[model samples]
Target: SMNPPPPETSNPNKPKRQTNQLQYLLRVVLKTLWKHQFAWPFQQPVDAVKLNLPDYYKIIKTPMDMGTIKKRLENNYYWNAQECIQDFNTMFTNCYIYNKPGDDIVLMAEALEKLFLQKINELPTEE
Candidate 1:
């Protein structure tokens, strides 16, 4: 979804779950956002690589790559995974999506890594 797609799909050996998973939900969001974001082609023909930024499909697709993640953080982008997960957690806890613990919303917990996008990117710069 992001760049190079998520790992699940980007990987060579991983059982692809057919049932509804975070990846599936993410794919839907990514596709939807892609269409809307690209609608602004006249804005600058859109960067071919960053055209599909913050691909939510990874929620079900594959693990996002370092390059794509780097793009977001280097540019001061912090609302991607963090915001997505916080919002997802809100939905999960507030009885919006499933209203159950460890439900499909469990992915939110897994998204903890998103919280450090900025920190992760700053590693090389910090030294």
Candidate 2:
């Protein structure tokens, strides 16, 4: 006798298509930032001890950087686009807080922030 066939299976937990698109957009933006000339300071976590800035930890409690963001993205740590965007905001805000307003570092952060906003605006919306 022939064996009976099993029913078709489905995965309800599969991520939405929109989420994949959003993730792709985030990756594109992150890679662009990493390639920017002014991205050096933001590329990795600030080394307070090596830089001799003892107050760095006291001032910047939550440090964010491009490398951390990339890792988070790869690990699926962000729940939404806003969460990812907020990390970038935090990174730049930390820079602004720790450095002088007119300092070269601040200027670079400002430029990068502007570029981020410009790219994020291009993300497709549900509406």
Candidate 3:
């Protein structure tokens, strides 16, 4: 007679499957964010030298951008949606910190931030 498999055999694979699902959800949201009109400034990292902002790197210790986030996502750098969300927040936070309140880039960042918040609510829960 053959022995039955243990119930624990199925448990190990479940979490990984859910991680992939979250990755897909994040990818879709990022793509939509990239397409926004105000997404131009955030598409890539800030050019400290070219932009003439000498102290840009000084104040913003950790710079984040869409391109960088996309690369990290594809490389499996983010284990969960919260990690990805944090990066997006950092990107906007840097903008607000470096730019003046009435500046165009700051305005764009504000618009994008609102959109991001709306999109994140649609993400699926792990439970």
TM-score of every prediction relative to native: 0.22, 0.79, 0.79
Give per-residue CA lDDT, model 1, range 1-127, as digits (tens): 3244221213334233322222322444333333442222211211225645343332323233233333333343332344333433332233222224654433433343333232333323211
- Candidate 3 stretches with Cα past 4 Å from truth are 1-21
Report the lDDT tens digits of candidate 2 across residue range 19-114.
753575556788888889999998878877667887887788778888778766665665577767878899999999999989999999988988
TM-score of 1: 0.22
lDDT of each: 0.32, 0.75, 0.74
Residue 81, model 2: Cα distance from true site in angstroms: 0.8
Candidate 3 local lDDT, residue 58: 74
lDDT of 2 at 125: 66
lDDT of 3 by residue, 1-127 (tens): 2222211212333343337545754566688789998898888788777677888877887788887777666655655777778888999999999999989999898888888888788776666
Q: After superposition, how far is residue 71 of candidate 2 from its true place, in Å?
A: 0.4
8, model 3: CA deviation in Å?
Answer: 36
Deviation in Å, model 3, residue 113 alpha carbon: 0.7
